[model samples]
Target: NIDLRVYSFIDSLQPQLASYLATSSQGFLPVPGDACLWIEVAPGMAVHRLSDIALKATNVRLGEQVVERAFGSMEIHYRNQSDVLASGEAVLREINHAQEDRLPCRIAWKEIIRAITPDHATLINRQLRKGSMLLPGKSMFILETEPAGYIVQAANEAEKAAHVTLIDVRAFGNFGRLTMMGSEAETEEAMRAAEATIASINAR
Candidate 1:
């Protein structure tokens, strides 16, 4: 019952956090579970918590609130033990409405930096090695834009259209940055999807 404007799926299960959690933490093994996705809209943050609102509203018995939050963005990742996911999603779209002048989701920076197998391996073994899934034959694209929602939506769309892997997503408060990798063709397609999604959203 979700709308195209609300979500873009990358794979059957996404919002991959293995590398994030592993490196972000100095403890714990890779625990496993099914992923239920939910998009949260925070018109503004640094003054509020979107997760708090959606969780309180939906009242879903969720397991592992493995979510990422910042600025005015939150994409929920959980084990849907109950059937309240629909209720939660409904509340997300209803949360906020801003005027045209306050529009914040405009792209400002974009770049694609790709590496060969050898370079990738070397890079992986260096400062970027830990907590990264960067394998051989993959390219990375970096993006920074206003409103975390645009980038999240773009990244999700990119992953949905191409076989790319999202490397980093620094979403929230102001401008957000994201990195993604995949095969040459896939990476190109994925990046295009991301860019197109952002432009389209901004146009609206």
Candidate 2:
């Protein structure tokens, strides 16, 4: 049986995150303001079937598809929100899974470091080597999701909540990590929105 690891959707893609995804993803790149759907399943290759179903159901662009050893994930997007939503529904219908059937998002780790030091920022920038840069004296927010795929949605929500720079986002693996840099107040708002989004998904 296929296990639904994550089923999340984004109504609107923010600019920095959209550019970041476009830079990192291999498939058709998604642009800012596009609606997006993310789905992950166990047994890895099943994501191919789900991707096919989603594509067949609507005129959505496949931004990324990763078939890992233990799990698989897909990112689909389109200009119209309804199209993205319809595609996600089609995938769920074909897989015989409900939105709530997916694994509940768990906050594996969360922190906000204020006024980062130049040394630490440089090390982090060198280590990540992608996305936006983390500068000294900026507040950075870090979040980790247990199922991995949910981190993408958290990143989206955080971006919508406040102005922040996207540092990195890893959405396919055992755990998903999101890093963002902004002012302390903005980072706090972003963190709150990210946590609230996870809580809402869990409550669902």
Candidate 3:
């Protein structure tokens, strides 16, 4: 059985998050305000079938498709929300799973570090190429999630709620990790917005 790990729909892509996603995208790059969909499933290879079904069912563009050892995830984006929603449903129909059937996202870890050390910021900047660099003395927000895919939605919602710099997002792998940098107030707003978004997803 295919395990639907994440079924996330982002109504509007924020500018920073969109640009960050564009950096690593091998397919069509998404722009700000685009409608986005993220689907993740276990046994990685099965993702090909689901992506194919989505592409054939509606006019949507693939931004990213990753097939890893344990899970596969894909990003679909378009200017029209209706097209994205239709494609999401088409994949759901083929897999015989409703949106509610997807796994409930769980927060693995979350922390806010104010005034990060120079050494830590330098190390993080060295590793970050897809998003903004983390500067010394800036507040940092980190979030880790079970089942990897929900982190994107968290990042998007956080950006919507506060003015934060997108440091990095790892939405595929053993777990999802998100890092953002901003002022203390901004980070706190982002943290709250992110947690609220995850909570809403769980309730759905």
Best by TM-score: 3
Clashing pairs for model 2 are none
Error of 2 at 106 (Å): 0.7
User: What does candidate 3's lDDT look like per residue over 1-204, in tens digits?
Assistant: 787888999999999999988887788999999999999987789888988889888889999899998789898999999999999998888888899988988899999999999999998888855788899999999999987889999999999999999999998887899999999999999999999999999997
The whole-model lDDT of each prediction reads: 0.50, 0.91, 0.91
Candidate 1, residue 46: Cα displacement in angstroms equals: 7.7
Q: Best to worst by lDDT, what's the order?
A: 3, 2, 1
Candidate 1 C-alpha lDDT tens digits along 1-204: 211223321122333543343344332322223233434233234113445554566544322222334323334433443424553444445554322222446677787667646676466447543335666655767788865545645666676688776666654445767777776788788778878876665554
| lDDT at residue 192 of model 1 (Cα atoms) | 84
Which ten contiguous residues of candidate 3 have the minimum total lDDT? 124-133
Q: In candidate 2, how many Å is residue 47 off?
A: 0.8
Give per-candidate clash totals: 3, 0, 0
What TM-score, over all chains together, does every model reach? 0.57, 0.96, 0.97
Best of the two (2, 3) by lDDT: 3
Position 35, candidate 1: lDDT? 35
Query: Candidate 1: how large is its RMSD?
Result: 6.8
Best-to-worst order by TM-score is 3, 2, 1
RMSD of 3: 1.0
Full-model lDDT, candidate 1 = 0.50
Prediction 1 TM-score vs. true: 0.57
Residue 149, model 3: lDDT of: 86
